[PDB]
Homo-oligomer: A and B are copies of this chain.
Amino acid sequence: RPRFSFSIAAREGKARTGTIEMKRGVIRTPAFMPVGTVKALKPETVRATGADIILGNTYHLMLRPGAERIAKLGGLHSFMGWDRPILTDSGGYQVMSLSTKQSEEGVTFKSHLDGSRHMLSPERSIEIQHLLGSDIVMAFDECTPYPATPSRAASSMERSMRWAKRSRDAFDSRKEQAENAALFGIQQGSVFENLRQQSADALAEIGFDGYAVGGLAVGEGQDEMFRVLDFSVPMLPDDKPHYLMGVGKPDDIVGAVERGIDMFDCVLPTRSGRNGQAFTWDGPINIRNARFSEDLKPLDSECHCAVCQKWSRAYIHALIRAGEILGAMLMTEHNIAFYQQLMQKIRDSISEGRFSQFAQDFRARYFA
């Protein structure tokens, strides 16, 4: 297989379906990436749900067990037992939310677990992702809060573009990484169309294997997110994958695909699983609710996952109520499987030129 090849097989409006070919496997797009361990699931179970690629959280791995240790033990794929592609984030987002002194060189921060001091820069982020053995590497950027003034959004976007060039050069300096992995750049600019355009222009001049739309899902609400995607995604190179970071709910995903997004990740299906929220085609349910205590139906009436084949709502209700590990295992398997089934229906409907109708039918039932 090639290092990286994105092929578009079918289109409907702004929506696309296709494949990314990488050395460790093929990724069907639009794709949902479960976030990693993928909590409460063995890798074989994650694969059985249909996932082609998972996301590794760089910030957590660099604190424990550490990037150098993972490299010494053979890299992240070997360590956790997932042999398909892994996308790693840059680590910078969780620094600004979980761990600080920022500068043009990077950020220094104290670990939220031990108070130990750490450093992240474009160069060190790319190095850590190399040590983990990531297949898709994210450029290191600077986050813009919401809301942001135009001056603040411009300053952070401009720094992010300088850091994108440093990320590109760091990635390219490392022969093994340049030859075997891919590098994605991140568009910034908050809700401002001129800043998004300047960011897209800068990233395309540098050149990346794919382009993320950054700075969304930070509190702006779905209407505003869709409005920004409306003008932002067409600014990115059409022939490369478009990645919406940190999104999201099923209806967010459908609307984002309608606007040209190809890749998604979020902790929602996993985090919601342990919390009691199960996704169904008729909307989410909270399995902890007393109304499910004697409900013999599966979590979802149509879902093909192994949980819905075997166990009832009533049983999963009792497990989650009791705080049993198996309740988290089953809820998470179902939720990840539901997301993969959603992505499959999206890919099929685009391939068949009926995605617009699918999106209408999905929303009508999901919000009935």
Interface residues of A in 300-338 (CB under 8 A from B): 310-312, 314-315, 318-319, 321-322, 324-326, 328-329
Assess A42 versus B293: contact at CB under 8 Å? Given A65-B318, A73-B312, A315-B80: no
> CB of A41 within 8 A of chain B?
yes
Partner pick for A326 among B37, B318, B321, CB 8 A cutoff: B37
Residues of B within 8 A of A234 (CB): none
Is A2's beta carbon under 8 Å from chain B? no
A79 to chain B, nearest CB (A): 6
State A80–B318 Cα separation when bound (angstroms). 10
Is A329 within 8 A of B64, CB to CB?
A: no
A40 at the interface (CB under 8 A from B): yes
Within the complex, the shortest CB–CB distance from A189 to chain B, in Å, comes to 36
Assembled-state Cα–Cα distance A40/B330 (Å): 10
Contact among B41, B65, B319, B325 with A293 in the assembled complex (CB-CB below 8 Å): B65
- Tell me if A294 and B69 are in contact (CB < 8 A): yes
Cβ contact within 8 Å between B326 and A42: yes
Q: A39 an interface residue at 8 Å Cβ cutoff? A: yes
Known: A73-B315, A80-B315, A325-B325. 19 other contacts (CB 8 A): A37-B319, A39-B325, A40-B329, A41-B326, A42-B329, A64-B318, A64-B322, A65-B293, A65-B318, A73-B296, A74-B296, A79-B312, A79-B315, A81-B310, A81-B311, A81-B315, A325-B328, A325-B329, A329-B329
